[PDB]
A paper describes a structure:
The crystal structure of hCE revealed the typical five-stranded antiparallel β-sheet wrapped around a central α-helix. Two disulfide bridges additionally stabilize the structure by clamping strands β4 and β5 and the hCE-specific appending structure that is inserted between strands β3 and β4. We compared the affinity of glycosylated hCE and non-glycosylated (E. coli produced) hCE towards cathepsin B and found that the affinity of cathepsin B towards glyco-hCE (IC50=5.7±1.3 nm) is two times higher than towards E. coli hCE (IC50=9.3±2.4 nm).
Author numbering: 8 to 124
The structure:
């Protein structure tokens, strides 16, 4: 078995960004809201070395005006989805654990825990 150091990374790190996008996309596939949520801010980002790499992300999200009825996943561009304003506006502070392995393309959201703000 292989277990490594838990290290702090920059939120702007390009591989942290991909992990975040995989974390958000997985949340939307399993969330109860009609609207797609979107990452607004990445607060903290750590990485741990395993047979692969685990990414421990603390990040803020926001509900959008984009709906699952009108737009399907895998074909949704969250950059074209505006944050909902008033009445619907819902914010979440989420902890994400993203596993990335070399033999796979799709990263996995292994665990999550969101908390309204």
């Amino acid at each position: 078995r292989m277990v490594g150091e838990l290290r702090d990374l920059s939120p702007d790190d390009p591989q942290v960004q991909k992990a975040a996008q995989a974390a958000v996309a997985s949340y939307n596939m399993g969330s109860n809201s009609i609207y797609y949520f979107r990452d607004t801010h990445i607060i903290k980002a750590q990485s741990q070395l395993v047979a692969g790499i685990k990414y421990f992300l603390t990040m803020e999200m926001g509900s959008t005006d984009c709906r699952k009825t009108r737009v399907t996943g895998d074909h949704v561009d969250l950059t074209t989805c505006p944050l909902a304003a008033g009445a619907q506006q819902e914010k979440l502070r989420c902890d994400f654990e993203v596993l990335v392995v070399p033999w796979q393309n799709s990263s996995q959201l292994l665990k999550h825990n969101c908390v309204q703000m």
